[PDB]
């Protein structure tokens, strides 16, 4: 039973800063590929990021230079820093943990900005 | 809710005690412990399940249910909800809603 | 944007807002848990020639046993009987001499359970 | 047979009786009660019974 | 010799009910599906009963776009009776739906209908864009925003 | 809108006898030759019931005035009707009969029946004017004067007449069980024909349940509606009215009583034994038995 931690998000107002954090505990056959979707109420997943253990990261077009992704090798976790939030970014962002069968999916972090 | 016998979300769909329960429920406030400031949203609570829990049965699904006729296949939307929302936990809050 | 909000009241007071009742076809001379009105049971269930008043809705027994009742969709009338029930006891010579034995069913049929049928029961594996 | 047929007949009746329970019928017990209280019901049912 | 030794029982393997076949219905497409609508300051409350009330066709029909409700779950109406159903149908904006539900604040929850915390009930709402709205602007529902 | 009327004056009471009648099935379970014992409201065998007459002439000059006081509703009350042209048209129950508390109201007109519970503002003389028309006179149109007005109405039932048209010795008895129990008011019925007999007659007849209705208010209290042939603006020397008022009403109490009712093969009560009658009684109920052996 591969289990992702997602957590650090919540309420913030426009211009604010977070940073979220999936820890991937289990299995998690090394070479892996760790990745952020976005969902507002009403679309689908949206691809917002992707890291592999070649260290590239892979960034849409949505959050140009804006949203950025952190690993830590030793835990394999991941971390993406929010920042320079706009209202357009209030969705709930899940984790997915390509691994090499298995993918894997997650529980779920409110992201609010507005004001 | 902690006790055999009992009801509730967490009664029924959470942990599940049983009635011949040879046993001690123990408990103190974490107020200056396990609340932040921004709020400590690192613990998930399931509201809906399609059953109520066998005793000390554990479920880590993350299945989202289908509160209406469609199905959900995984994704959100109408009818369709998470099972884990988040918690609260303030400095702030009142005895109630303390963790 | 049109908005109803439908209050509803919760009060130690008879109901007049009533919800939809499930209903199933009425499987008759079966073995069958039956719920005619709210009446709760098991057993089977045979077309019977009473005539019950249009007011009543079940029949009793000497004791307190419901022996008839009164389909709501269909109006005829249907008496109840107890699913089929009784002892099995075991007709065996001693153990020292053989272990072949013969089973009696108390007060059944030969059909709900080298057959004899006996106001006894029926019997199975003695020979008549 | 009069003495035989009335001992029968107390012992059916003694079904109805509630001896303390919220309902002499079972099913009406357990579909209105959670078991842990629905075993303090059905307790004073078995013992008036047996 | 003979011994007692089971007791043989037939079992039942199937379940029917039988309930009077559903006939009364509640006036709820007068409600949901009523031509016109009051304004937020003469509200329609009205009152339903000595009616059978199939909530399913209103949670399942999927044609309103709120469902809340506080005190009761959605999927358990159709199994509680109830003494008296109050229905109250508004036209009122997406915004201010928000302002419909127990504990809330604003110019329609603080002067408009008041919400006890303490309700019991269901909160549908939908949305009027091709029945409510004309091309020159539909000013028939009236709104206060001041009072004592 | 009311036509208020004269002084009831007062009218000393009158009783008569009521042989065996008011018994009513208490339940809906169909019972063949069998003898059930119920622990109920029931009416006491001969007991003293009190009989009204609809119109009364007892004043020297001639003055014939409806006698429909307001009579106590305790734990149920049996209502009986010996009557030939259709002069009583349903009743009103409450507390305070008027518009502080919620109250039940029953009329029967030619076609149909009318149950409402509202807020009525209840006149002290309610009734129905009551007049044929100048052609056809098969049916009698009905002007009600029974409230001024009503609000806070949650209830209403119509359904087919409780009272059958009565349109010269054709006296028909029409007996009536109401009781309110558990916020549900429960009316039983039956209709006989009767011949040559003024007061109630002896024998038995079984009240079928009629309906039981959710109103679920509090009674104490209720009254009779009656029809006005006659007009209250010139009231006739004699005979405007029905024959001096023939027809009459008796009203009795229900009590709680064991009985032992014998249902028939046929599913009818065919006899019932008030425990608390006569000693004979008693042993009757004792040994569950209608015979006794020496
Ligand atoms: C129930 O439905 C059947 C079939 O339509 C009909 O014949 C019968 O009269 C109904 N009974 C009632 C009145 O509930
Ligand atoms: C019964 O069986 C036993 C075997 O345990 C044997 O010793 C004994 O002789 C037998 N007796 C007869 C009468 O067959
Ligand atoms: C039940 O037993 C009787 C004998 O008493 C027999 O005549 C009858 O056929 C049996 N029933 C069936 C279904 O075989
Ligand atoms: C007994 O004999 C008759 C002939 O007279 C035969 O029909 C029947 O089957 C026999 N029964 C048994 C149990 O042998
Ligand atoms: C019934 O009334 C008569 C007088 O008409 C009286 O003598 C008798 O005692 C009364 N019976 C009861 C039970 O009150
Ligand atoms: C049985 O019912 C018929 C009517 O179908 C009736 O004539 C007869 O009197 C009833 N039996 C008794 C004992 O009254």
């Known amino acids: 039973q591969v289990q992702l931690q997602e957590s650090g998000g919540g309420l913030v107002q426009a211009g604010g800063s977070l940073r979220l954090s999936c820890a991937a505990s289990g299995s998690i056959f090394s070479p892996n590929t760790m990745g952020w979707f976005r969902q507002a109420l009403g679309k689908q997943r949206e691809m917002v990021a992707v890291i592999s253990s070649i260290a590239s990261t892979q960034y849409a077009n949505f959050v140009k230079g804006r949203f950025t992704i952190t690993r830590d090798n030793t835990k394999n976790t991941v971390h993406l820093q929010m920042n320079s939030l706009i209202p357009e970014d209030t969705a709930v962002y899940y984790c997915?943990?390509?691994?090499?069968?298995?993918?894997?999916w997650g529980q779920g972090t409110q992201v609010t900005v507005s004001s | 809710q902690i006790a055999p016998g009992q009801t509730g979300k967490i009664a029924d769909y959470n942990y599940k005690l049983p009635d011949d329960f040879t046993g001690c429920v123990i408990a103190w406030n974490s107020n200056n412990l396990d609340s932040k400031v921004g709020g400590n949203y690192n613990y998930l609570y399931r509201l809906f399940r399609k059953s109520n829990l066998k005793p000390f049965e554990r479920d880590i699904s993350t299945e989202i249910y289908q509160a209406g006729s469609t199905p959900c296949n995984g994704v959100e939307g109408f009818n369709c909800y998470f099972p884990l929302q988040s918690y609260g936990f303030q400095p702030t809050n009142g005895v109630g809603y303390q963790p | 944007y049109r908005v109803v909000v439908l209050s509803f009241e919760l009060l130690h007071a008879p109901a007049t807002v009533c919800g939809p009742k499930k209903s199933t076809n009425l499987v008759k001379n079966k073995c069958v848990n039956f719920n005619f009105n709210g009446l709760t049971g098991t057993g089977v269930l045979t077309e019977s020639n009473k005539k019950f008043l249009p007011f009543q809705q079940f029949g009793r027994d000497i004791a307190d046993t419901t022996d008839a009742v009164r389909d709501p969709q269909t109006l005829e009338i249907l008496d109840i009987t107890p699913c089929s029930f009784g002892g099995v006891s075991v007709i065996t010579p001693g153990t020292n001499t053989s272990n072949q034995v013969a089973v009696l069913y108390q007060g059944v049929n030969c059909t709900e359970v080298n057959v004899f049928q006996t106001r006894a029961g029926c019997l199975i594996g003695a020979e008549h | 047979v009069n003495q035989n047929a009335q001992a029968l007949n107390t012992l059916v009746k003694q079904l109805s009786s509630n001896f303390g329970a919220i309902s002499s019928v079972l099913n009406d017990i357990l579909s209105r009660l959670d078991p842990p209280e629905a075993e303090v019901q059905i307790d004073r049912l078995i013992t008036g019974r047996l | 010799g003979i011994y007692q030794t089971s007791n043989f029982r037939v079992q039942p393997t199937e379940s029917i009910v039988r309930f009077p076949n559903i006939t009364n219905l509640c006036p709820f497409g007068e409600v949901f599906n009523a031509t016109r609508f009051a304004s937020v300051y003469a509200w329609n409350r009205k009152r339903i009963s000595n009616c059978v009330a199939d909530y399913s066709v209103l949670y399942n029909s999927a044609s309103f776009s709120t469902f809340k409700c506080y005190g009761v779950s959605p999927t358990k109406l159709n199994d509680l009776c109830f003494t008296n159903v109050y229905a109250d149908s508004f036209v009122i904006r997406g915004d201010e739906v928000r302002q419909i539900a127990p504990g809330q604040t604003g110019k329609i929850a603080d002067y408009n209908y008041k919400l006890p915390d303490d309700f019991t009930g269901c909160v549908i709402a939908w949305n009027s864009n091709n029945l409510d709205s004309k091309v020159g602007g539909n000013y028939n529902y009236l709104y206060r925003l001041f009072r004592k | 809108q009311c036509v208020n009327l004269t002084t009831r004056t007062q009218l000393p009471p009158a009783y008569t006898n009521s042989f065996t009648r008011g018994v009513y099935y208490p339940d809906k379970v169909f019972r063949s030759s069998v003898l059930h014992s119920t622990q109920d409201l029931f009416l006491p065998f001969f007991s003293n019931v009190t009989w009204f007459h609809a119109i009364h002439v007892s004043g020297t000059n001639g003055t014939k005035r409806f006698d429909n006081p307001v009579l106590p509703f305790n734990d149920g009350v049996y209502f009986a009707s010996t009557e030939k042209s259709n002069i009583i048209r349903g009743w009103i129950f409450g507390t305070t009969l008027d518009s502080k508390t919620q109250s039940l109201l029953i009329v029967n007109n030619a076609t149909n029946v009318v149950i409402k519970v509202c807020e009525f503002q209840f006149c002290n003389d309610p009734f129905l004017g009551v007049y044929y028309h100048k052609n056809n006179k098969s049916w009698m149109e009905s002007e009600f004067r029974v409230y001024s007005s009503a609000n806070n109405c949650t209830f209403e039932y119509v359904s087919q007449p409780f009272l059958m048209d009565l349109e010269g010795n054709f006296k028909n008895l029409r007996e009536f069980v109401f009781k309110n129990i558990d916020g549900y008011f429960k009316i039983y019925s039956k209709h006989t024909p009767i011949n040559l007999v003024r007061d109630l007659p002896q024998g038995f007849s079984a009240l079928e349940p009629l309906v039981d209705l959710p109103i679920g208010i509090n009674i104490t209290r209720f009254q009779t509606l009656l029809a006005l042939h006659r007009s209250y603006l010139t009231p006739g020397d004699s005979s405007s009215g029905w024959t001096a008022g023939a027809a009459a009403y008796y009203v009795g109490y229900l009590q709680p009583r064991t009985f032992l009712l014998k249902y028939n093969e046929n599913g009818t009560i065919t006899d019932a034994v008030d425990c608390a009658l006569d000693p004979l009684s008693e042993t009757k109920c004792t040994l569950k038995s209608f015979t006794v052996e020496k």
């Open positions: 997915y943990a390509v691994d090499k069968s298995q993918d894997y």
